[model samples]
Target: KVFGRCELAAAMKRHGLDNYRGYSLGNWVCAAKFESNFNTQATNRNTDGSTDYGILQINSRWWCNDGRTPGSRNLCNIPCSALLSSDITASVNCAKKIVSDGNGMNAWVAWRNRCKGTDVQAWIRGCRL
Candidate 1:
């Protein structure tokens, strides 16, 4: 699904991820942009043979079941396909879990490598909420 900047911010707020646990919504916005461009259906195949799912690019390695990847820890106890939809509650919740598990968005290499010091005011600029 395509999302405008404001739409993304609103969704993140609704999911309680906008600055949840001191993590800026800007970090989320930048991660979404770099990970999946805010497209719910996004997926990526890694050289390590792990497939990333959804806008957050959640990995089957330890997050969800992709049906094809073997030895998935499946800690999220959900299907990878559950993430690839316009409603991102599951994805965001799992991400929060991952953060609480000590990953702290570091689970996403993109967030760490690209978004840490970037100016992200425009991600939600002009958004009413």
Candidate 2:
């Protein structure tokens, strides 16, 4: 499913992403915008054989086990396929883990490239929090 910006904001908030670990909801929202354009089934395989999955595009090399990545850390201990589901809680939870691991929002290059050190409130302007 491809979610509208506001719908993605609401779903992410419901999953406890709002202000999680000092990162505002805007950070997550913006990351999703660039990562997968809020598409649930999105997947991208890197040249190194790692795949990024779901709206947040959680990576198989570190977060989820795809059984294909040679040294998948699977720190989230979830099947990579789960990230592709319409329900985004799994992606949210894994993102939290990524942040908690001291990676902060830097785990996603999209966030670092598009959201970090920027005014991200625009990402959630009409979502009404």
Candidate 3:
């Protein structure tokens, strides 16, 4: 079930994440684990019964809605299916954008800290990417 390192590296590059190449596979692995539990097709229903779908937990209806359609919700339309069908790097990159607005992987770090028992600086220090 392991994808090769070169292939994964290429995928990251394609998604504008060349900077991450130097990081430990553990960083990316940790992101994948917390975001969707590494599930490309994960989805969740909020307490109000709203839907959050796919790997990055994008709220599809929010972006695709016929009304409003502004703010963070604008990102929800990128489509988890697209990410899922795309290469892992593309998917991970898309997920990163959705969660962090391409904001330096801080969201992934937060998720790792809150859910996976690691601090952001520790993750950055250990990962180096």
Could you say which candidate leads in TM-score?
2
Error of 2 at 64 (Å): 1.0
Candidate 1 residue runs with Cα over 4 Å from true position: none
1-129 per-residue lDDT for model 2 (tens digits): 899999999888888888899888889889999999889999998988999999988888888999899967989989999999988888888888989987788888988988999999888897755
Show the lowest summed lDDT stretch of 10 residues, model 1.
116-125
Q: Deviation in angstroms for 32 in model 3? A: 0.9
lDDT of each: 0.86, 0.90, 0.47
Count: clashes, candidate 1 = 0
lDDT of 3 at 129: 29
Per-model TM values vs. the true structure: 0.94, 0.95, 0.48
Give the number of the best model, judged by lDDT: 2
Give the worst 10-residue stretch by lDDT in candidate 3.
Answer: 120-129
lDDT of 1 by residue, 1-129 (tens): 878878888898889997776888888988999999999899999887889999899998899998888776898889999999889988998888887787687888999999877787667778877
lDDT of 2 at 28: 89
Evaluation by lDDT, superior candidate among 1 and 3: 1
TM-score winner between candidates 2 and 3: 2
Candidate 3, which segments miss by more than 4 Å at Cα?
Answer: 1-25, 61-72, 99-129
**After superposition on all CA atoms, how large is the RMSD of candidate 2?**
1.0
Q: Model 2, residue 124: what's the lDDT?
A: 89
Clashing pairs in 2: none
Error of 3 at 88 (Å): 3.5
| Top-down TM-score ranking | 2, 1, 3
